[PDB]
């Protein structure tokens, strides 16, 4: 029965119990249920008034932590004689939560999530001699999945007639704005046992509803005579969180952002054949008090 | 205007701050909420579900052989079968559990635990075991005389193929720490040992080696606080195709 | 009292005499889609006794070096009976499932089965960074075999798979397991040919062992869809 739990449950005193027909310590794991044996029923207890609050294991508090989701250093200079794969004072980022593994393993403790994303953008700069650090203006334009992303720093997609841009400087506090719950479903699919399209050559595991969009970030300034290395870090805090159907935590190291492929480490712990590091025997106690 | 002054901590970005920020899509109407089965509103719901211990965390136990403990018939009385290190923070049999993984996101913990053992021999296999929890302070008890002086349960196999060993919250103050010192007075939980109470007696057509599966959950007096990152995942490089998100 | 059980759906019925208490997944029972959660505006077909009935898959042989078996739903039923014809002629489906898994042996056999229904079991491949293709996921009626069941073939852990709706078949205790699954999706209805929502996994945590005569022990899966709706009527593909 659903009830409101604010502190952990108390303990009642118990006495000697020697009754036939009543075996509270015997259970049936085959039913799929967890044991209902109380501490009052297994050993003889005292009355303990338990005042330990349970508010830090709330799913809101467990998940509303600002975690790093993106990180790009890109050279800020004159790019008239650079390569075809370089970031010419701008970058695009297909928004995911699967690149950095602390937030990934935490979100993948659930099958479905419904949350508002609070995005914090932290820009830092280094001189690529030393003459000082410029207070550069950056534009982070939110391009949805379906629109056109810019191909230049000075392209005309950056005018943002309808795309939401934020204009922020390096000397400012970090730029912060809230992205809503933007899924076409009622919850995001953290795991998607399916294929994204109607033909059989689609991508497995990537629900297109889960992807927020693109995050195109440029430097609005024109180039100086010297070059700079501008590092942009994006931090996401989930909020107003509903979570469904919790999952086993991932034990093996992640291989890719696109799938749940697994290799494991070479030896235990977190290996393919041994998740827990080994001991000598089942009757060997590793940290034994001498 | 209003005379103001800036305090220390102005313009900082604490990653645990709780404020309102600017909406990036004004007048956006979210998708209507649908009833989805299995909603979690507190992570202590998950911690109370039992999950398998890897008591057989030894070499030559490969994969799923680590999840079961093989017991056999013995020719000597009162013999130790296995013991379980109750060190949750250090890598032992309790780490890859639902109670083990969620607690490693926290530094402090409190409350009772329950160990459940399911006997997975034949119907014809009979036996009695004694499952002893020992409070800390001494060594791990190797004989049955020494071990049964603490918290124990004596289990007869049969129609109900499982017992629960409640590991009671027996501690000085309210919480214990997930310290890397397993031998500390504020982190050590104690020991769980299993002995033959009588013996495993099987007939000639049953398999002479039977298995136990050990489960562990937390009770509803269990508590966790002081949230930290988990040691159970890490990276030193980028994941594959993470550069393709920028291309 | 909780060991005998008769499950009557449609023109089908299953009696079992060594059962456990059956499992309702997340405390939920299957229902039809209500009007305040409906999306598709056309009138759905509800072929009640024609589709809400047990369908029995092919039995798998339960051996010494078995790793485990999995069937993805509704992919294991998209070609069977009038459920499969309603799947192929419609664009949308919505149903719960009543999974009954059968496995019996003598009182001299031992072994334990983790019979677990996994929501949205996105699989992973081993020792590669290429995603699993279409033929590695959509095995159909025959289902697949676990490659590494200790990690559930997705880097997770078999030990913590009891967070999912599950039962056990311990041969000492019972010979059947029953899980009642509701609709489990972020969507009200779904395209059944490109998305699987429940994976039934059946895993040898304790292997089969005896010292009496070696008969074949099979494991049989009977799956009943429950409360089927279908929208988007067209031709069959």
């Amino acid at each position: 029965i659903e009830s409101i739990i604010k502190t952990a449950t108390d303990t009642v005193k118990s006495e000697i119990n020697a009754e036939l027909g009543v075996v509270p310590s015997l259970n049936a794991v085959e039913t799929g249920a967890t044991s209902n044996t109380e501490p009052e029923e297994a050993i003889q207890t005292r009355t303990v008034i338990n005042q330990h609050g349970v508010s830090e294991t709330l799913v809101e508090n467990f998940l509303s932590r600002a975690a790093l989701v993106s990180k790009r250093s890109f050279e800020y200079k004159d790019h008239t004689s650079s390569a075809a794969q370089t970031d010419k004072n701008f970058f695009k980022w297909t928004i995911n939560t699967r690149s950095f593994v602390q937030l990934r393993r935490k979100l993948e403790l659930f099958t479905y999530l419904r949350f508002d994303a609070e995005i914090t953008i932290l820009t830092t700069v280094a001189v690529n001699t030393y003459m000082g650090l410029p207070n550069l203006t950056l534009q982070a334009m939110f391009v949805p999945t379906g629109a056109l992303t810019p191909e230049k720093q000075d392209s005309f997609h950056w005018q943002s007639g309808s795309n939401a841009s934020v204009f922020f400087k390096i000397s400012d506090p970090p730029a912060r704005m809230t992205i809503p719950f933007m899924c076409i479903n009622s919850a995001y699919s953290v795991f998607y046992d399916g294929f994204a399209g109607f033909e059989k050559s689609g991508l497995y595991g990537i629900n297109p509803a889960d992807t927020i969009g693109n995050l195109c970030v440029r430097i609005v300034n024109e180039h100086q005579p010297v070059g700079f290395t501008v590092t942009v870090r994006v931090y996401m805090k989930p909020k107003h969180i509903k979570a469904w159907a919790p999952r086993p935590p991932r034990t093996l190291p992640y291989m890719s952002i696109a799938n749940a492929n697994y290799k494991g480490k070479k030896r235990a712990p977190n290996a393919l054949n041994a998740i827990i590091g080994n001991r000598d025997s089942v009757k060997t106690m590793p940290h034994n008090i001498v | 205007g209003v005379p103001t002054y800036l305090l220390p901590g102005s313009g900082q970005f604490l990653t645990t701050d709780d404020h309102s920020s600017a909406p990036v899509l004004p007048c956006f109407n979210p998708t209507p909420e649908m009833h989805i089965p299995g909603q979690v509103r507190n992570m202590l719901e998950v911690v109370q579900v039992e999950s398998m211990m890897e008591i057989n965390n030894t070499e030559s136990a490969v994969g799923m052989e680590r999840l079961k403990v093989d017991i056999s018939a013995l020719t000597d009385v009162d013999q130790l079968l296995f013991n379980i290190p109750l060190d949750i923070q250090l890598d032992g049999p309790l780490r890859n559990t639902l109670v083990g993984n969620i607690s490693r996101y926290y530094t402090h913990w409190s409350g009772s635990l329950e160990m459940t053992f399911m006997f997975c021999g034949s119907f014809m296999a009979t036996g009695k075991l004694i499952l002893c929890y020992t409070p800390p302070g001494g060594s791990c008890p190797t004989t049955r005389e020494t071990a049964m002086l603490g918290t124990h349960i004596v289990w007869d196999f049969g129609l109900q193929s499982s017992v629960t060993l409640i590991i009671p919250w027996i501690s000085g103050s309210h919480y214990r720490m997930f310290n890397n010192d397993a031998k500390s007075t504020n982190a050590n939980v104690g020991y769980v040992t299993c002995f033959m109470q009588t013996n495993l007696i099987v007939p000639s057509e049953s398999s002479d080696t039977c298995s136990l599966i050990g489960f562990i959950a937390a009770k509803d007096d269990f508590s966790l606080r002081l949230m930290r990152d988990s040691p159970d995942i890490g990276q030193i490089d980028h994941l594959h195709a993470a550069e393709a998100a920028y291309q | 009292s909780d060991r005998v059980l008769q499950l009557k759906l449609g023109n089908s019925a299953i009696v079992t005499q060594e059962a456990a208490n059956y499992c309702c997944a997340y405390g939920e029972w299957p229902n039809y889609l209500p009007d305040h959660e409906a999306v598709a505006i056309d009138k759905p077909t509800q072929p009640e006794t024609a589709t809400d009935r047990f369908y029995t898959l092919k039995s798998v042989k339960w051996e010494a070096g078995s790793t485990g078996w999995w069937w993805k739903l509704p992919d294991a039923l998209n070609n069977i009976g009038m459920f499969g014809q309603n799947v192929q002629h419609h664009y949308l489906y919505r149903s719960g499932f009543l999974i009954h898994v059968q496995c019996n042996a003598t009182r001299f056999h031992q072994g334990a089965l983790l019979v677990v229904a996994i929501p949205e079991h996105q699989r992973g491949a081993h020792n590669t960074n290429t995603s699993p293709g279409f033929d590695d996921i959509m095995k159909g009626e025959e289902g697949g075999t676990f490659n590494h069941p200790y990690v559930l073939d997705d880097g997770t852990s078999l030990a913590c798979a009891t967070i999912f709706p599950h039962q056990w078949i311990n041969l000492r205790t019972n010979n059947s397991a029953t899980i009642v699954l509701p609709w489990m999706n972020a969507a009200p209805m779904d395209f059944p040919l490109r998305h699987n929502q429940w994976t039934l996994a059946i895993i040898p945590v304790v292997p089969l062992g005896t010292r009496t005569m070696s008969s074949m022990v099979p494991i049989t899966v009977s799956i009943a869809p429950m409360c089927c709706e279908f929208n988007g009527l067209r031709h069959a593909i």
């Binding site: 029965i1 659903e2 009830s3 409101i4 739990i5 604010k6 039913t31 799929g32 249920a33 967890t34 209902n36 349970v54 508010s55 709330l58 799913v59 809101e60 508090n61 509303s64 809230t178 809503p180 719950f181 805090k237 909020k239 107003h240 919790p246 | 709780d18 404020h19 309102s20 920020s21 600017a22 909406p23 899509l25 004004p26 007048c27 956006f28 979210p30 089965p37 299995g38 909603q39 509103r41 507190n42 202590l44 719901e45 998950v46 109370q48 579900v49 959950a217 509803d220 | 909780d2 456990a20 208490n21 059956y22 499992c23 309702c24 997944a25 997340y26 405390g27 939920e28 967070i163 009642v180």
Partner: peptide, 29 residues
Amino acid sequence: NFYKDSYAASASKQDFSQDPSKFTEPVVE
């Protein structure tokens, strides 16, 4: 919350309803 959108608000950390029995006792009796 001086913003006009309700998702702009701060984190809602006051939801103390639990139901562990949908995961610990999912049996019908």
